[PDB]
Each structure stands twice: as C-alpha cells, then as structure tokens.
C-alpha cells in the first residue's frame with residue numbers, strides 16, 4: 343500500500359502495482375446513502391444501476407472495458423477496468439459517461455427498465471437476504487431519524503416514487519468536483535494519468551460545494567421483525583462504535599478480532615482460541631456469528647451478528663456473548679490481545695492488499711476523501727503493535743460497560759428476550 | 774426425564790401461539806427516555822379515565838346496598854325507641 347496524490351482543481355490519486363496485469367480508473371464521490379433523504383432514499387443505488395446499464399455496458403465492452411459501481415454509506419464509486427495500456431480509453435468512457443451522457447442514460451426506456459430492475463433487486467434482498475437485511479435494520483434503528491439510518495439500496499416505497507428529476511437533483515448536488523477524487527489503481531503510473539486528464543478541459547459542474555445537514559446519533563433501541571415461517575433466528579446487536587479518524591479506531595477493531603467470526607460447520611473454525619467457543623459449542627447455540635467494528639464519518643457500530651437454529655437457547659447465546667464482552671473491561675488477557683494483534687494484521691492485509699484493482703480504487707478514493715491520503719499498512723501495523731491490555735480495557739470501559747445497545751432480528755426470535763434483559767448483561771455485579 | 778402432559782403454554786422458543794409474520798415492533802432504551810415525569814403529566818391528566826368508564830358498574834350496586842343498609846338500620850333504630858315499641862311487639866314475636 344503506497345500512495346501518490348496531486349491536484350489542479352480535480353484531485354487525482356493513484357497507487358501503482360507493477361504486478362497488476364490490469365488497471366482501474368474511476369471517480370469516487372464523498373456522498374453515499376447517508377447523504378440522501380428518507381424520500382429520495384435509493385437514488386444512489388439508482389445511479390449505480392444506470393451506469394451499469396445494458397446499453398452503457400455494451401459501449402464499454404466493445405472498448406475492452408469492464409464497469410463497476412459501489413454505493414456505501416459515506417462514499418460512492420464508478421470505476422472502469424481495462425488492460426494496462428488501454429487506460430487512455432477508460433478515461434474517455436468516464437468523461438463520456440459523466441460529462442456528456444446527462445440525458446443519454448436518462449432516457450425513458452433505459453430509466454423505467456433500470457428502476458424496474460433495482461426494484462425487483464431490492465424486493466429480493468428484503469425477501470431473502472436475512473443476515474444483511476437484519477444488519478441493515480441494525481443501522482436503521484441505531485441511527486434512526488439520522489443520516490446513517492438509511493439503507494444503501496433504499497426502500498421499496500421511495501424507490502418506486504423516483505423519477506429522472508430525482509436522479510438529476512442528486513447529481514447536481516453531489517456529483518461535483520469538490521466532492522470527488524479521480525482514482526487510478528493497477529500498474530499505471532501517477533505522472534501519466536494526470537496528463538490524459540489535462541489533455542481535456544472544461545469545468546461543467548464545478549465551484550459548488552455539496553450540501554450539509556444534521557450529524558449521526560446513536561440511540562439505544564431495537565427493531566424486531568419476527569417471522570415464524572423462517573427456519574432460523576438472525577440477530578445483530580451492537581453498541582455505539584468508532585468513527586473513522588477516532589483515536590480508538592484500531593483498538594475497537596482489535597477488540598472485535600478477539601471474539602472474531604465462527605462457522606459451526608467448519609472443523610478449523612471450532613478450534614479457534616476464543617473463550618466464547620467453550621460456552622456455545624456444548625449445546626450448539628448457533629450456526630455462526632461474526633464480530634465487527636463498523637466505522638463511518640460520523641459514528642460507528644461495534645457488535646456482532648449471529649444465525650441460529652437453536653431457537654430455544656437464544657437467551658444463552660446472547661448471555662454468553664455479552665458476558666464475554668464484559669471481560670474486555672475487567673479481565674481480558676495479554677495472550678488474547680496478542681492473538682488479536684496477529685489476526686487483525688492478517689485481515690488488514692487481505693483487505694488492503696488483494697490482487698484486485700477495483701477494491702484498491704474504492705479504498706483509495708473513500709479514504710483520501712476523508713483524511714487526504716490512504717493509510718499505509720506499515721503505520722497501521724505499528725499502531726496495532728502498540729495496543730496494550732490497558733488500552734483495550736479503557737476503551738471497553740467507555741463503549742461497552744453498561745452502555746446502550748441497538749438490536750435487530752428476524753425469523754424465529756421468540757426466544758430473544760426483552761431489551762432490558764439484554765441491556766442488563768452489558769455489566770456485572772460487584773462489591 | 775419423564776414425559777408430562779401437554780398444555781396450552783410452552784416456553785421461550787415454543788410458547789404455543791400461532792405463527793407470527795408481518796408484525797414489526799420497535800422500542801427505545803429506558804436510558805434514552807425522559808427521566809420519568811409521566812407520574813404527573815399523563816397519569817393525573819389521564820386520571821379518572823378508568824373511573825368514569827367503570828364507576829357505574831360499581832356505584833349502582835354500592836348505592837343499592839348502602840340504601841338497603843341505611844333503610845334497615847333506621848327501621849331498627851325506630852323499632853327500639855319509645856315511639857316504636859308498639860310496632861316492635863307486632864313484627865317481632
């Protein structure tokens with residue numbers, strides 16, 4: 343992970359990789375679902391889909407280019423992939439699609455079909471993707487009536503009320519130069535991509551700043567979507583976590599790594615050095631779980647998600663997990679922190695250094711849009727190696743011990759007890 | 774453990790009710806709610822609700838019995854006063 347960034351109005355950032363074999367060029371905006379309203383919610387997912395439209399994709403396919411678009415909470419990306427030399431043609435397609443096709447892609451035939459696609463797409467997700475649907479409701483109840491609560495794909499209600507005018511108004515306010523970063527990852531060199539950008543000119547949609555509003559706030563609450571027809575109980579629970587640029591960003595991630603992820607069906611997963619495993623395998627409290635330390639611009643979420651068929655012992659699953667979390671404040675051991683350090687590094691490694699250029703493009707853009715430059719692993723590893731048991735305890739003492747929680751769940755959740763019973767387990771009795 | 778009989782109530786996870794689908798519920802942590810002031814805002818205001826709706830079902834029988842008591846109590850008082858010894862000799866033996 344090595345960065346290089348320059349500017350001339352349009353901020354350009356790249357990251358060379360001599361052993362790439364391909365290259366990805368694109369634009370990333372510092373506005374995602376958290377920059378939408380409860381009524382135009384889904385407008386970004388809508389943009390993503392028209393950019394990947396059938397027509398637009400053919401025009402790129404003939405050019406030997408592959409398209410990619412990712413909608414998140416804080417950022418939004420549109421990336422083009424090609425061979426290392428065809429990079430000059432990728433920028434032409436980008437310039438063509440976002441500085442000329444302001445009405446090409448927004449035709450009544452293309453739009454109504456795309457709208458129809460994302461509509462069925464989202465209907466399916468809400469209908470069958472239980473673990474992600476639950477996790478989305480977790481964000482929805484935790485940050486309710488606040489920016490961070492809106493689902494990245496949007497709601498079926500506001501999705502079907504959208505018109506080309508909604509797409510345009512969003513573009514006019516967010517697809518601006520001051521809210522973007524041109525990204526180039528793969529094998530291409532920095533002092534070469536900027537030239538092709540300087541080769542052209544104009545300034546259509548510039549000078550203007552994006553809009554502002556209220557900041558994300560965590561609220562202790564819950565949303566229960568009971569469905570007895572499903573074969574499992576899917577739940578997600580979390581406390582208010584850390585925002586990107588928080589002093590405890592790495593400490594929180596190390597804490598999540600301590601409890602990690604688990605798949606009851608994979609032999610090696612059952613053997614991990616996570617004390618919680620000794621409590622949940624006796625009666626097989628779940629099929630799987632995974633801890634997380636989600637971080638965004640305004641706030642974060644630290645917690646876990648689980649899936650279980652043991653619908654009569656959900657109280658034990660929750661009880662044991664939260665009881666292990668208490669340990670982070672009062673008894674986490676040195677070895678537990680050292681095992682977490684090793685594995686956090688490993689995960690940060692697989693994330694920041696995959697052989698995939700589109701992954702690096704999204705990470706580069708989204709990061710420079712906040713801190714001004716992507717963080718190197720070498721520095722990340724140094725901060726991770728410096729984390730002490732005390733750091734973890736001090737952190738747990740403020741974000742975990744006797745703190746409000748956000749819960750969401752669907753399926754056979756009758757066995758999931760009331761809020762207070764769950765909230766109580768966030769601390770222990772003592773003299 | 775031995776097999777005991779079936780009942781209309783089970784336990785957490787298999788309570789005995791019909792399958793539930795389509796109902797979504799929401800709640801907020803007591804820690805995030807206004808430090809309890811609903812003792813003299815929506816309790817004294819909404820007070821006498823349970824009163825004016827049900828009081829008749831209690832008051833009429835209460836009144837019927839109280840009247841019957843007072844009536845019989847006064848009759849007894851008269852029966853045992855000087856003015857009532859004549860009627861007392863009659864109604865008694």
Ligand SMILES: CCCCCCCCCCCO[C@@H]1O[C@H](CO)[C@@H](O[C@H]2O[C@H](CO)[C@@H](O)[C@H](O)[C@H]2O)[C@H](O)[C@H]1O
Nearest residue numbers: 668671742743744745765766767768769770771772773
């Ligand atoms: C039979 C008649 C006899 C009656 C005797 C009365 C007993 C009184 C016990 C009083 C307090 O016992 C005390 O309770 C509080 C919760 O209220 C516990 O607190 C625990 O939960 C609270 C949250 O609610 C956390 O903030 C706290 O960090 C945690 O330790 C505390 O650790 C325990 O020590």
